[PDB]
Design a protein around this ligand. Structure first.
Ligand SMILES: *[C@@H]1O[C@H](CO)[C@@H](O[C@@H]2O[C@H](CO)[C@@H](O[C@@H]3O[C@H](CO)[C@@H](O)[C@H](O)[C@@H]3O)[C@H](O)[C@H]2NC(C)=O)[C@H](O)[C@H]1NC(C)=O
Ligand SMILES: *[C@@H]1O[C@H](CO)[C@@H](O[C@@H]2O[C@H](CO)[C@@H](O)[C@H](O)[C@H]2NC(C)=O)[C@H](O)[C@H]1NC(C)=O
Ligand SMILES: *[C@@H]1O[C@H](CO)[C@@H](O[C@@H]2O[C@H](CO)[C@@H](O)[C@H](O)[C@H]2NC(C)=O)[C@H](O)[C@H]1NC(C)=O
Ligand SMILES: *[C@@H]1O[C@H](CO)[C@@H](O[C@@H]2O[C@H](CO)[C@@H](O)[C@H](O)[C@H]2NC(C)=O)[C@H](O)[C@H]1NC(C)=O
Ligand SMILES: *[C@@H]1O[C@H](CO[C@@H]2O[C@@H](C)[C@@H](O)[C@@H](O)[C@@H]2O)[C@@H](O)[C@H](O)[C@H]1NC(C)=O
Ligand SMILES: *[C@@H]1O[C@H](CO[C@@H]2O[C@@H](C)[C@@H](O)[C@@H](O)[C@@H]2O)[C@@H](O)[C@H](O)[C@H]1NC(C)=O
Ligand SMILES: *[C@@H]1O[C@H](CO)[C@@H](O)[C@H](O)[C@H]1NC(C)=O
Ligand SMILES: *[C@@H]1O[C@H](CO)[C@@H](O)[C@H](O)[C@H]1NC(C)=O
Ligand SMILES: *[C@@H]1O[C@H](CO)[C@@H](O)[C@H](O)[C@H]1NC(C)=O
Ligand SMILES: O=P(O)(S)OC[C@H]1OC[C@H](O)[C@@H]1O
Ligand SMILES: [Zn+2]
Ligand SMILES: [Zn+2]
Ligand SMILES: [Zn+2]
Ligand SMILES: [Zn+2]
Lengths: 412, 413
């Protein structure tokens, strides 16, 4: 099998620092006291460099052979806008990129921009900008001339996978569709990305290429909320239309942003599953004061069929933050292998569709395992009542507004 | 502020402890003798009731002293005849103490060391992997990385970084390999390869700019109440001291248990240069043999150190007045003394303690009278130490190697 790494939502806090005053440990705790801070971080803080470095060091010495890596964005930390700048955002993105380039000098890496990869956060523009030009220079070792051009202009690109003939990564800037982005309200095709996408998929079809879609913010519905698409409904519907029509060219979709481990199955209006969608959890464990849960840090690995790119498996690795802070050593370890964990043959839309049918059933243990993995095993005492469970299952299976409304109507 | 860490040792839980009319049934550890005057927190002829250990940890938890870590130097099973214990029962007691600690202090890194009772039969700790070594590796996994786990499983020792104190590394030796009653290690130059490993570890700490705390159960040096009786066999004491003297600029503290007493030692080179300070902490158990006239009150202690630096600033000894707690049926864990305050020294550096023990040596020194009262953790203010006793004490405090100690006894007995 071939395989590739997926990391996302690094969220470096350069001010991380263990000290007596726990309000003064990380700017990302937002002046609040870190709750239980260690060298690898705190649930109220974004990532210390030690955390991110231990993640990449684990990948490097994992004994796992991978031919590329996808990196779906969000490197700067959660601090107030006035505490950041264009210069500081570029500095953080540069530090992450150089960390990866130094540690992995021969691995092609496919980054996507996240909503924090810009100053001010979430305001990613539909024309060229300092941040887009900067990341185009930063990621030149991995991208051709045409990808550099589109990235500099709109924050998105496509690129052939050098080590995998017949595979192409499409890296979308889905922050253009993200609710908080006040730069793109009421535009029908912000930065022409839709027209660009269709052109690119059309060319991949005729060059007999397979396509992996990557982006930061995903399609579909936020699984913990009611009727809340991750991106604006209008853009979600239009993107999903493109994905459904090209579902035989697209062999996988990969997203981050939610900081959780979620599955989705893109389906038609009739219940034919068409593509498999994978939302990866964050390296940062950060949470607000009120939130009951957060994720353990996570990195993950995908296995696919050589020269074919059908997804065969996924391996989710994680770091137990409380224990790593307890002993002062990062024990990055196997959380689960998807096929083994859910007893499915592979990751094809059909296998996952049948597995989520099992999820639906009453007191499904499959769904309990899934819910425990949603938080990257942060808390097995976490529970999901039947309202919670309906919201989750309906978001997993129904990506478009009408399938989703029908699911909630029939099952809430 | 300053950094602080706790030291507990020799818990010696007796799970049979039990107030009943027949005082030969109060505790297996009295070995059928009549408990003297048993109360809820123990008896001088018994090992620790679980109520006593839990009161010690409860006091630590609710003391209002912050601490970034704890060291725990061994001996959890009680003193009962070998045929009354087993490997399974030893593991069961060790597990209970570990879980008690993890339950009350879930985010406190603890650094355990094995004691000579932490094995069945007692004292027979082996030089290869074993049921108990594996089990405690399992048990202590939350606090220890992969390399520590590997050495612990094989020989019962490890080193480990202090998560909360970067630049600090705990070395937990298994000195029971050197302990006279250990029949598994006779005529062995480096049992379980611990010396070789220790030297390697210290060399690594040198080049990684780490300071080191040595912890173990059985101490180096000479038993302060006897003549010419090293706590571990002479051959091993000399070898270990040679290592400690050579690395005494890297080692910022040594901490031991086993003697159930409050004792100081100053490791010195052959010319009296005080090199490195040694703290033997008294036990939680108050157990004593029938003929034995004195024993210790239960004790636990706290060390203060310079942050990012690990020079030792002070030590606070806390104790339980056993008779008082048993009289009312409620404990009152309380300050026995602060070392700088008790002895008017500036800190815990070798030079400061060296000067202090020079004062000890003077005739009718009040400093040494206070020290000898604290030796039993204040168990008897009428316990006295004649001039022979004093010479044994002072010479054991200052002279850890046989040559030094012989020289001291010659000049002063
Ligand atoms: C720990 O608590 C015990 C019990 O409270 C303390 O022992 C008690 O100490 C008092 C004061 O010395 C003793 O009373 C005195 O006895 C003599 C005659 O023996 C008498 O002349 C005095 O007027 C006074 O009554 C008392 O007997 C003794 N109790 C027991 C059970 O031994 C002990 O001092 C405490 N330890 C520390 C370090 O404070
Ligand atoms: C991550 O590590 C922590 C600490 O080592 C684990 O916390 C323990 O969890 C169990 C219940 O799940 C309790 O019985 C223990 O008392 C907890 N703490 C300690 C100090 O023992 C936690 O289980 C680990 N996470 C996972 C997914 O295994
Ligand atoms: C450790 O052992 C103690 C003492 O045996 C436990 O507390 C006792 O639990 C037993 C259950 O067998 C009860 O019969 C006793 O009444 C309890 N109290 C006393 C004072 O004996 C304690 O629960 C154990 N702890 C762990 C973590 O296993
Ligand atoms: C590092 O993490 C792994 C995974 O949690 C630990 O290995 C497991 O340890 C548990 C607890 O003893 C066992 O139940 C599992 O069977 C182990 N699995 C494997 C594959 O070994 C490992 O011990 C941890 N290392 C340290 C030093 O804490
Ligand atoms: C879809 O693509 C067709 C083929 O495009 C040409 O050939 C492929 C192999 C690529 O090299 C591509 O870049 C070339 O331009 C076009 O003939 C057709 O016009 C396209 N259709 C649309 C609607 O864009
Ligand atoms: C003493 O240590 C020196 C330092 O190098 C170490 O190398 C590896 C093994 C790690 O432990 C690393 O942390 C250290 O920097 C060695 O170069 C030297 O050979 C060692 N000498 C002896 C005699 O052991
Ligand atoms: C943080 O906790 C400390 C507890 O010592 C308290 O003094 C301080 O006021 C707290 N600050 C905030 C912002 O909660
Ligand atoms: C990135 O920042 C970290 C944290 O300040 C620093 O340790 C590291 O050297 C930096 N790396 C690069 C390549 O700038
Ligand atoms: C213990 O004391 C009881 C009651 O005074 C006495 O009958 C018994 O002989 C004593 N047993 C031993 C072993 O000393
Ligand atoms: O990192 P962000 O893009 S601000 O937000 C994405 C995730 O982290 C915080 C939010 O609650 C959401 O779960
Ligand atoms: Zn994020
Ligand atoms: Zn985001
Ligand atoms: Zn003991
Ligand atoms: Zn002992």
């Amino acid at each position: 099998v071939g395989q590739f790494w997926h990391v996302t939502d690094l969220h470096l806090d350069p001010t991380y620092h263990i000290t007596d005053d726990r309000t003064k440990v990380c700017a990302s705790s937002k002046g609040a006291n870190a709750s239980n801070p260690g060298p690898f971080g705190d649930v109220l803080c974004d990532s210390p460099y030690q955390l991110i470095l231990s993640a990449f060091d684990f990948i490097k010495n994992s004994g796992q052979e991978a031919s590329f890596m996808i990196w779906t964005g969000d490197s700067p930390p959660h601090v107030p806008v006035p505490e950041l700048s264009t210069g500081t955002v570029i500095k953080v993105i540069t530090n992450m990129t150089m960390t990866v380039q130094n540690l992995f000098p021969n691995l092609q890496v496919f980054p996507a921009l996240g909503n924090h990869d810009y100053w001010p956060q979430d305001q990613l523009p539909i024309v060229t900008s300092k941040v887009y030009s900067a990341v185009a220079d930063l990621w030149k070792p991995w991208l051709g001339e045409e990808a550099i051009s589109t990235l500099k202009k709109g924050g998105f690109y496509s690129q052939k996978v050098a080590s995998n003939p017949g595979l192409r990564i499409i890296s979308l800037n889905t922050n253009l569709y993200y609710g908080p982005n006040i730069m793109t309200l009421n535009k029908t095709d912000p930065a022409n990305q839709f027209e660009w996408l269709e052109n690119t998929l059309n060319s991949s079809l005729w060059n007999k290429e397979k396509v992996y879609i990557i982006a930061h913010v995903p399609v579909g519905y936020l699984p913990y909320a009611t009727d809340t698409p991750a991106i604006r409904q209008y853009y979600n519907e239009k993107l999903l239309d493109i994905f459904r029509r090209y579902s035989s060219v697209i062999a996988g979709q990969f997203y981050g942003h939610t900081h959780r481990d979620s599955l989705m199955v893109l389906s038609d209006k009739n219940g034919n599953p068409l593509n498999s969608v994978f939302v990866a959890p964050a390296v940062t464990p950060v949470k607000g004061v009120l939130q009951k849960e957060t994720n353990n840090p996570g990195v993950r690995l995908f296995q696919y069929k050589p020269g074919d790119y059908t997804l065969l498996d996924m391996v989710q690795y994680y770091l137990n933050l409380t224990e790593a802070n307890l002993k002062g050593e990062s024990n990055w370890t196997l959380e689960y292998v998807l096929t083994q964990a859910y007893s499915v043959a592979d990751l094809q839309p059909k296998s996952l569709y049948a597995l989520v049918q099992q999820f639906a059933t009453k007191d499904s243990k499959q769904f309990l395992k899934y819910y425990h993995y949603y938080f990257v095993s942060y808390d097995s005492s976490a529970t999901c009542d039947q309202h919670c469970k309906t919201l989750q299952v309906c978001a997993i299976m129904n990506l478009d507004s009408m399938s989703y409304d029908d699911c909630l109507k029939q099952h809430l």
